[PDB]
Amino acid sequence: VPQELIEKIKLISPGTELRKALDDIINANFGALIFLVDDPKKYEDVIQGGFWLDTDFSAEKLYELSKMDGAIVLSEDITKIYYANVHLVPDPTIPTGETGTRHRTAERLAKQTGKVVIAVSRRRNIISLYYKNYKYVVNQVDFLISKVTQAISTLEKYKDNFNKLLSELEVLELENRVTLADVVRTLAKGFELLRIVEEIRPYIVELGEEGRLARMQLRELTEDVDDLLVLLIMDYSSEEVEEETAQNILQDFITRREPSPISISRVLGYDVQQAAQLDDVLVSARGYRLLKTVARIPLSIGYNVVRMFKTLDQISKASVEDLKKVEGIGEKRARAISESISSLKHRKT
Amino acid sequence: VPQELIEKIKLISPGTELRKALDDIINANFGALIFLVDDPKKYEDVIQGGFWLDTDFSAEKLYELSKMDGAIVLSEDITKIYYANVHLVPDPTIPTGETGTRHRTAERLAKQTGKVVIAVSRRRNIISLYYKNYKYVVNQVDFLISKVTQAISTLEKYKDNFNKLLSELEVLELENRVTLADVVRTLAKGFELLRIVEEIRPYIVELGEEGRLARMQLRELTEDVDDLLVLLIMDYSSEEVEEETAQNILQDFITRREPSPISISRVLGYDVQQAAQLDDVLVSARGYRLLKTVARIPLSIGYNVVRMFKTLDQISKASVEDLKKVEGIGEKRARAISESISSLKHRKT
Amino acid sequence: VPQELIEKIKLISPGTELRKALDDIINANFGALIFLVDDPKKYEDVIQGGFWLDTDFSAEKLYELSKMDGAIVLSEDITKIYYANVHLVPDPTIPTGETGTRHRTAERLAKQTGKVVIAVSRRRNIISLYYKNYKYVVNQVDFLISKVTQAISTLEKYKDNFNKLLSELEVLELENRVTLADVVRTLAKGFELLRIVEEIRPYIVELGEEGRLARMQLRELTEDVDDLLVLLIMDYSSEEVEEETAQNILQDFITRREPSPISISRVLGYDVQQAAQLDDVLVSARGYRLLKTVARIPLSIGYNVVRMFKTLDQISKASVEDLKKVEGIGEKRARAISESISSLKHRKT
Amino acid sequence: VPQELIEKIKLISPGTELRKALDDIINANFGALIFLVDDPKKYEDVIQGGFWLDTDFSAEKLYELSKMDGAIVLSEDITKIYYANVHLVPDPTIPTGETGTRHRTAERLAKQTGKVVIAVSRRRNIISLYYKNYKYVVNQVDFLISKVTQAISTLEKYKDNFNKLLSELEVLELENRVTLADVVRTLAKGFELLRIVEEIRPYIVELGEEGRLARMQLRELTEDVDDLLVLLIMDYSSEEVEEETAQNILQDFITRREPSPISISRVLGYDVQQAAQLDDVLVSARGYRLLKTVARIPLSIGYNVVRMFKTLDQISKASVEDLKKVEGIGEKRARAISESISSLKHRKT
């Protein structure tokens, strides 16, 4: 979806006075055909009859004006109503996939002038916005909220299973008993979960001001999930990987590639064929996840800790003194690393 | 529900252009009577008047055509509109349980020709599909989603209680303090939960593309429940049972038999009369559940481990060396079995 | 709500063909006035004009007949339609709180004959049923489900807080560190929760077949709550109390008395004035809750265990041999009591 | 929102007979213009034509009367209907931001007389109440419940993350390993959560009797959150702070100030610049939270315990005897403090 169109869709999103007028118009079953232009003069060839108003815009004015036949012409910044009751006459030979005079006129005019044309028919409750060669159907809030509420419920279920996987993985990691299967399973669930977020995103945007609660919920449910997945990648990839690369792995599995077990283990640098092999590959966390998330050591510095001790297993054996030999690790960091890992082992394993 | 009919129901499921036209028709309160035929020629006896169109199908075309009285005739693959405004005249002596000319005509024609006939009346918002001697009422998406959302909430509650039962059962199993009552109680909840899934299934299918989120939720909620229940059967049945048999027990209690305590304990091979006796029967898990789910040992091989040690109690006492004497158990499997069971005991009991 | 009326309300509950016809009638905005009689003959004085049909009942027939003015007369068992289009003429001097001829006629006739009279007006979507001097407004399913879904959500929140209270109480009980405040707080939440169930009950019934999922949810959420609360009463009441009495305490606090802290502590036999005193009263569980729920010892026998050891504190110190000296406690029960309590202490405290 | 207006809004809230009549009027699409006056005589200048009724008020009467053009005049206590079908004639030169004669008349009359004027138009389903220079749009219950149900779901998510933060903070506190970042993070989530409650409040009120379940849910979800946050403030502020001050911090961050990390750490008395510094500031709880919430020691007395031992760290080391040296700490309190803290350490750390 071109950003160019996104900017236009904002014009008729829940919250704006324009959308306010359009909803009223839908409820009254009157029709509407609105043409957004910067300078009316250069468009007089496609504007016939009607009335010249050149007055300030308001939702009430638009609604009343729409009781008459024909089209209304507004300024692109929706601050002025220039015409009402006019006949829009774009070139009839322009191709159109629309049905019914109102929408065919809207599409051709948008294509012809490169300007925005809004159509609202009587036999339906949806807003169609035409911009250049683009068409965007705007749904009603009730419909959007229904889909979004279901997507959120679906997310809660994925998050729950994700929390359960990560919790079990934590036990295994602390006991150094992890297998590639445990990692991939956890990654897959995470990838699939963030995929849902990406898919519902266009719905949230379309909700405008009425999607505020929905955004808040998505934020609380997927808070640190992305950071967590990256750290998992940095910790279990076959060979060392920088954060930025882990992020590319994440973005890739969120949109491009499908999060299938074999496919994830492959990108992680493991040469596997059948998913049955995953339960046989033993792996050891490097310790980034725990270092950054629990010991609160900046990644930049964790790099030094990992380069020296290699794995979480070794770091958990290190002493306060042993850890200070690391560049960037003082008394506080050293104690923080040692104590937080020891605390976790005593509680979770 | 014959699969034969299921194939026809797909034709008018949410997502198809046909359903798109039918919804529009419902919203406009126009009526509709659609007859699906392969070759119009051999049906000219039941097709009177109207107009010959022989044009490409589209939802907009169907909607417009439906503004006229009579019926529309389409190709079975919904790619062609052959007739519009015709009078369908099946044999009037054919029995019909329908009311009102439109539905009586549809049922008799479907019965007469063995073809699909779709009826949509003005005084209601539902689609009736007739195929041979079958009738399928298609509900609106709003209604379906309402029932499905309630069924999902109901499932969440059953799953929660199931998780609680399984969690307590786990403690008991690790402490070798299980009674038949603990097993049956856990099985019953599991059986009842999967029963809900089976019952809501026809609703999910009827939802078509709009049931995608619902499917995802059902999948996250009942993920490994079936495998888990089978393993429970394999572990607590009075006498050894092969997986395939455990599965038959599952399928049976999901559809045929009622998951009553006594009834489950009976099928498991225990001769009980009153539910009060269940709290008195001590039982010991064979160890399949833990072997497959936690130690990740293939069932095929677990069979060997169980045939040698008999119960989880004995396996938990076995040593790495003792376990390797089993056919198919190497150093890795042996360590995996021993360590995962020891880890669980230290954490859960 | 008299059971007598409940039986009549079933006649028009979701699921019945009668309600099916009434919903259709509501959607069409036609009106309806239905009079249910056993023998039409003895009511000819209040039945004028119309048509004698004496035909078999069906929803389609009722719906069609309702397109005409006047009333319809059916058999009490809803198997026969005796009249259609008649004028019902009860005594006009009979008092009525209704407005509009249709409802005034219905109420007076029901009062006059002691029979059921159903009225459905055009300017609204609700069914009014009149039986003798009773009036029952039947709501639409959509409305009912909305209230019921909210009540269920509200219940989930109370159950969660209840689980948290009971969980903390469990720690305290095992450590013999309980105070009257911990008990009352847990009881109050339980009482309030079951109060919600009682209040939503009339809604579930009114839902008929469409309240099946709602019932299942209420059952999963409040499963053993009543038994649990009774045992809590038996365990913390100032002086010994029999189960049956504990139950009266429960029923009382669910309907009659308000579950205020002081009020609960008072009924439990503690003479307190200000809620501040509750945190100062130390109490010890007798052990019924744990004996019945965890050790699975029948109450009848727990009575003997409590009469001998007095408190959970003492039972937890008892030996297998010490416990067998109790009448009804064998080797199994004795082991069950001892091991389950010891297991709990090792895990929760 | 002036309380003065709140009192008027109650007049038309769900539950009242007046609102009952207004809903019926909305469903019928009749219009309504109601003027509430104490003494009709002194308003005869703005009341023209119509009918003098001087009869008792009822919803049915109001609904029927509204079928006629013009306005209805009721007594301020909604117990009397004085006029029906009248022409209200306020001064036309009074400014009005309304459109359409009905609303312009209502606003001007309310402004002119300082009395309540209720307007309901045909082309919409909302009630507009005018009082003096105020205007309050009353929404339908369906709309309100939709927003409120979403706000509750959003709250559940914030509460869950809050519980997780507080749970981890608890471990850290018991191990005396807390950093300013852990405290602020927990406070921020708490502050944001209570902010949602404040924002949805006007919706709950507008729901009237239909907002009962919603209130119950908000109460169960945010129960002790405020007390908990205050205690957190009292425990981690840079320098000692009295409860009343902690409360001002809470109220401030709930409405005025934005709960940004730096902003919270600043108000707590810590001079920080970049959020990165928070992970470096070690802090120790004074012990109020644990003393009041777990040991059940009144704040008034906790003040003495803290003034003597200073931190939770020191209190956890204190002996029963050491604690009794505190003014207000007896054998019970002393044991309660010592045992509850020791119990927590053994279970959570």
Coordinates of C-alpha atoms in Angstrom, one line a residue, chain A residues 183 187 190-191 194 225-257 264 267-269 286 288-289 292 299 303:
Chain A
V183 CA 14.6 -23.3 20.0
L187 CA 10.9 -19.1 17.4
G190 CA 7.1 -16.0 18.0
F191 CA 7.3 -15.5 14.3
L194 CA 4.2 -11.2 15.0
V225 CA 8.6 -10.1 21.8
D226 CA 10.7 -8.8 18.9
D227 CA 13.8 -8.1 21.1
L228 CA 13.3 -11.5 22.7
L229 CA 13.3 -13.3 19.4
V230 CA 16.4 -11.5 18.2
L231 CA 18.3 -12.5 21.3
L232 CA 17.2 -16.1 20.8
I233 CA 18.6 -15.9 17.3
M234 CA 21.9 -14.4 18.5
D235 CA 22.1 -17.2 21.2
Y236 CA 21.3 -20.3 19.1
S237 CA 22.4 -19.6 15.6
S238 CA 25.0 -22.2 14.4
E239 CA 27.7 -19.5 14.3
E240 CA 28.0 -16.1 15.9
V241 CA 25.7 -13.5 14.5
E242 CA 25.5 -9.7 15.1
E243 CA 22.2 -8.2 16.4
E244 CA 21.5 -6.4 13.1
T245 CA 21.7 -9.8 11.3
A246 CA 19.4 -11.4 13.8
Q247 CA 16.9 -8.6 13.1
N248 CA 17.1 -9.4 9.4
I249 CA 16.3 -13.0 10.2
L250 CA 13.3 -11.8 12.2
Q251 CA 12.0 -9.4 9.6
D252 CA 12.5 -12.1 7.0
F253 CA 10.5 -14.7 8.8
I254 CA 7.8 -12.2 9.6
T255 CA 7.0 -11.4 6.0
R256 CA 9.0 -13.3 3.3
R257 CA 9.8 -16.8 4.4
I264 CA 14.1 -21.8 10.6
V267 CA 18.5 -20.1 8.3
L268 CA 20.1 -20.5 11.7
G269 CA 23.0 -22.3 10.0
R286 CA 25.6 -18.0 24.1
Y288 CA 22.9 -12.7 25.1
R289 CA 19.3 -13.1 26.1
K292 CA 20.8 -8.2 28.2
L299 CA 24.6 -5.7 24.0
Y303 CA 29.6 -9.1 22.9

